Amino acid sequence: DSFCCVISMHDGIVLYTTPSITDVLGYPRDMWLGRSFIDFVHLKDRATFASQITTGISTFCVMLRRYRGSYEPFRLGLTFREMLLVICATPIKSSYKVPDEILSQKSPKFAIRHTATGIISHVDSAAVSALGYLPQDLIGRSIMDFYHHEDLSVMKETYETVMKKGQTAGASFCSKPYRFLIQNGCYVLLETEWTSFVNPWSRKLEFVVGHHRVFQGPKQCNVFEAAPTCKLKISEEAQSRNTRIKEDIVKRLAETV
């Protein structure tokens, strides 16, 4: 179930509002006829929207907000018509259906990728329905930021092996299930296969590519949802003892490949 909006260059606002909106999203047709779409999309996604309309004359997700006077996920798919734009905001759901699920083989194939510094550049869309992270939430942060601490000490050896193997013309050696936190805070186990691109001559690690196929869903299903917190621990003798192995896998980007 979707619904549409429409506009463009002279101001914004919204002209139409598919009568299927007082349903799918909460409020009435002419209810939106009021002002600019743009100020309906979460302060967050806002930035990418006005950059995807400029880069068009498709598809990309953003977070829209219901109306009661609880933002929800959406997958805007636009179309440039003669001007004005037709936006069919289809809502997006959470791929997991049970709890501590054990996804089959069909399970989507979503692959995030990152720079030596440890920052994810591109990030498949197939990952927004199984990680509750709309690209923009990520695409720009530190990949090491996610991994589970009681893990990066054994995670390291995995990353390393992407050099040793990344020393070949494009070797791919499949990792072993490793925890990784979603949007709701839970931890899934991806069945990650790796591969990197080392600049042939400067012989440096340009970027990593992880063909992430999920292997086990969250304790509490419904990715997106709300984000709690119960995980602390010796935030002194280890919350810094780890930053050691992290900021060590960062400096483990240097040539020697």
Author numbering: 238 to 294, 309 to 320, 334 to 346, 364 to 538
Sentences from the paper on this structure:
PERIOD proteins are central components of the Drosophila and mammalian circadian clocks. A structural feature shared by many eukaryotic clock proteins are the PER-ARNT-SIM (PAS) domains, which represent a diverse and ubiquitous family of sensory-, signalling-, and protein-protein interaction modules. Examples include the Drosophila (d) and mouse (m) PERIOD proteins as well as the bHLH-PAS transcription factors d/mCLOCK, dCYCLE, and mBMAL1, which contain two tandemly organized PAS domains (referred to as PAS-A and PAS-B) for protein-protein interactions. Whereas the PAS domains of dPER are involved in dTIM binding, the PAS domains of mPER1, 2, and 3 mediate homo- and heterodimerization of the three PERIOD homologues in the mammalian circadian clock.
